[PDB]
Amino acid sequence: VSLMEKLKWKIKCIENKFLNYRLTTNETVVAETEYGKVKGVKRLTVYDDSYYSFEGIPYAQPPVGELRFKAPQRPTPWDGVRDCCNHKDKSVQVDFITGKVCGSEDCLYLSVYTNNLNPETKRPVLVYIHGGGFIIGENHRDMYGPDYFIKKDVVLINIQYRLGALGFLSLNSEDLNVPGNAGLKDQVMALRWIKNNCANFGGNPDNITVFGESAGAASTHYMMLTEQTRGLFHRGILMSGNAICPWANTQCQHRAFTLAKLAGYKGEDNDKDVLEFLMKAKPQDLIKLEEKVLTLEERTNKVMFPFGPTVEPYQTADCVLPKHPREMVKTAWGNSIPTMMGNTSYEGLFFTSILKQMPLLVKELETCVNFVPSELADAERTAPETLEMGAKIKKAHVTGETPTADNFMDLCSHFYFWFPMHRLLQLRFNHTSGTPVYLYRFDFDSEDLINPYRIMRSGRGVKGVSHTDELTYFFWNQLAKRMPKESREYKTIERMTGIWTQFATTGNPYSNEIEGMENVSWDPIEKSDEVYKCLNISDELKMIDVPEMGKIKQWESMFEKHRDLF
């Protein structure tokens, strides 16, 4: 990221600090938790509303020293008042602006926001799981401010969980008790805390909605798949992701050795000696070196991250992914709660930045074999069958004689998001009570109000609605400003926070108390449906046929001779 964006961010960070000081009040409040009393503070928003804020509530033991890479443990209870008037640090990670490592191994906290501590009826509990490809992210308010949501009568919670190798290292040796998915196991324990404590903040433990975007979406879906959380929450929203996206799991049992080797390990490839080295290494060194772990082979086959969710090699007490996610959908308790899923109108437009450093990537569309789903493609990607599936992909996205950048980002929309959504829906239908699932397509484009990911994807002065563009209309961030109440931006904030809160309350996303939903008839998808219907959210809210359907079906034809792999 450029020096000018660096300094610009530095100045906004300085601005956000003083703003946060100003928007703070002296009104402190004490709530009960099952671990002891916590002191929160009331704060202001730029829209002249206020809210109670409890930050840095621990839901797990600090996972340092001998607990590193291990499943989380329940925290130690205290008797007195824990000061929750300040945020704790983020999980250790590389800063996407600066390039330097930040955060701390002590990161397992959550935040609890609400406009009213003593509501007359118990309220909807909304739980946000942040994305960041399982390697970056945080529940800090400079990135995920509750300011828009607190206008509604909800309780909003933002959790943290261990990222990267600290979050997702995996070892085969059953004696070492590092099966993997520690970061997901962090998510489970936070949920059990939210289950048993949200009533103290006026939340209804019998009406909890979990939702997330990107890796946050795959996390939400994983939380709906595992037995570990059965009956813990009642609604799910999957925003641009799910657990069968190609980036959302990986078999990383061999990659620990690679990481130890990068970090100074001298010796052989056996799991014990590797683990001991990794247990003593500096967290910043491990995190800094994750970038270099993936081979060229793996990047070529679109492996995006070294460490992430995985099928655990042996079953433990806290086990979360005991089989491949596609197998877990067939037995998921989550299949039987109300669900909302959706994508933006130009997801892949995110990858513009990556394309600029790697022009050659566009020539991949010449045969498209590198985008054939891994389970169908052969090793070298050279088998005649593979070139044939590749061709079905190329016919779907390449518009002219020669491939363009827009063909490429268009392909990515489908490779990383639409096609996996298609596969989940169909697979889910075969194994479900028949609870509704509702689709949205977020199609609203504005540059007047942005979020930090625009800095990352180099999204300055770029039209179209990229992945993460919708976060701007759900949370406050330190790049935001107050918008006039008549602006298209402000109205979309109202609509978005409105629908989500409507869905969270009733398990049904429609309300005629939302401006623009007058002629809207939003039906759930039926297995009988050849074509998916979705609410398209632009300046106007309109039900349409999913425009990506024709391409979606083309991808499906790759499985013609392999329908059991679908």
Automatic annotation (TrEMBL):
Residues 30-543 form the Carboxylesterase type B domain. PROSITE patterns: CARBOXYLESTERASE_B_1. InterPro entries: AB_hydrolase_fold (IPR029058), CarbesteraseB (IPR002018), Carboxylesterase_B_AS (IPR019826). The keyword Iron-sulfur does not apply. The modification N6-methyllysine is found at residues 6, 17, 37, 39, 70, 88, 195, 282, 302, 330, 356, 395, 491, 527, 533, 553. Keywords: Disulfide bond, Glycoprotein, Hydrolase, Serine esterase. GO terms for molecular function: carboxylic ester hydrolase activity. It is an enzyme of class 3 (hydrolase). The modification N6,N6-dimethyllysine is found at residues 6, 12, 37, 39, 42, 70, 122, 151, 195, 261, 266, 282, 302, 323, 330, 356, 392, 394, 463, 481, 491, 533, 551, 553, 561. The modification N6,N6,N6-trimethyllysine is found at residues 151-152, 533. Its EC number is 3.1.1.-. Belongs to the type-B carboxylesterase/lipase family. This is Carboxylic ester hydrolase. It comes from Lucilia cuprina (Green bottle fly). The lineage of its organism: Eukaryota, Metazoa, Ecdysozoa, Arthropoda, Hexapoda. The gene is LcaE7.
